[PDB]
Amino acid sequence: KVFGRCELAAAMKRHGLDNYRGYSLGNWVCAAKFESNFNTQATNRNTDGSTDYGILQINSRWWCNDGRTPGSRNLCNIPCSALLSSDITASVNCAKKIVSDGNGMNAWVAWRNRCKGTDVQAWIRGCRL
Ligand SMILES: CC(=O)N[C@@H]1[C@@H](O)[C@H](O[C@@H]2O[C@H](CO)[C@@H](O[C@@H]3O[C@H](CO)[C@@H](O[C@@H]4O[C@H](CO)[C@@H](O[C@@H]5O[C@H](CO)[C@@H](O[C@@H]6O[C@H](CO)[C@@H](O)[C@H](O)[C@H]6NC(C)=O)[C@H](O)[C@H]5NC(C)=O)[C@H](O)[C@H]4NC(C)=O)[C@H](O)[C@H]3NC(C)=O)[C@H](O)[C@H]2NC(C)=O)[C@@H](CO)O[C@H]1O
């Protein structure tokens, strides 16, 4: 699908992320346009041999099952492609605690540079919510 700016953010406030776990709902949406550029069909492999999945862009090495990653933990315990589909109602459940493991957004990398030290808060700006 192609989520336009105001149409790919309101879902967080539909999935339990608004002001969820010390991160304001606003502290998230910026990175989305720095992660897949509002798409769940943008995915890559990694130099590390790690593959990625979805707009979420998770790697199969540590988080989910694609099977080409042996010795991967898979604590999420669900098929990676379960995210890439246009529908995402369930897909947040893993991203939901990926921080809960205590490392924060530090698992995500772009958000420490493209949105961090900047005003992300100016990204969620203007959409009625
Ligand atoms: C296109 C776009 O927008 N983004 C681009 C992206 O697509 C490109 O590719 C990157 O792909 C990678 C995978 O190939 C994607 O995933 C991220 O990969 C990075 C790699 O650097 C991951 O970083 C490390 O991730 C591991 C796994 O979670 C981290 O380990 C956890 O850390 C916790 C705490 O921090 C640890 O816990 C405990 O620590 C205490 C300390 O006191 C200690 O007592 C314990 O012993 C210790 N636990 C043990 C026993 O280990 C624990 O080690 C572990 N827990 C877990 C596994 O949950 C590791 O710490 C991370 N590095 C640091 C340092 O924090 C990152 O986790 C991973 N994220 C995802 C989504 O899974 C990535 O999406 C993607 N890009 C990124 C990352 O932005 C890149 C090309 O390079 O370009 C992007 O732009």
Cα–Cα dist 15/8, whole Å: 12
Contact call for residues 117 and 90 (beta carbons, < 8 A): no
- Return the SS3 of 104: helix
Among 30, 35, 37, 62, the mutation site with the greatest number of ligand 1 atoms within 8 A of its Cβ is 62
What is the number of alpha carbons within 13 Å of residue 14 lying toward its C-beta?
11
Question: What is the CATH classification number for the domain harbouring 36?
Answer: 1.10.530.10
110 Cβ neighbours under 8 A, 6+ residues apart = 31, 34, 35
Binding site as annotated, residues for substrate: 101
Count: domains in the chain: 1
Is the torsion defined by CA of 46, 52, 57, 63 positive or negative? negative
DSSP state of 22: T
CB–CB of 113/37 below 8 Å?
no
Residues of the domain holding 117: 1-129
Give CB contacts under 8 A, 24+ apart, made by 8-12: 8/32, 8/38, 9/124, 9/127, 9/129, 10/127, 10/129, 11/88
7 catalytic, yes or no? Answer: no
CB 35 within 8 A of CB 71: no
Three-state secondary structure call for residue 53: strand
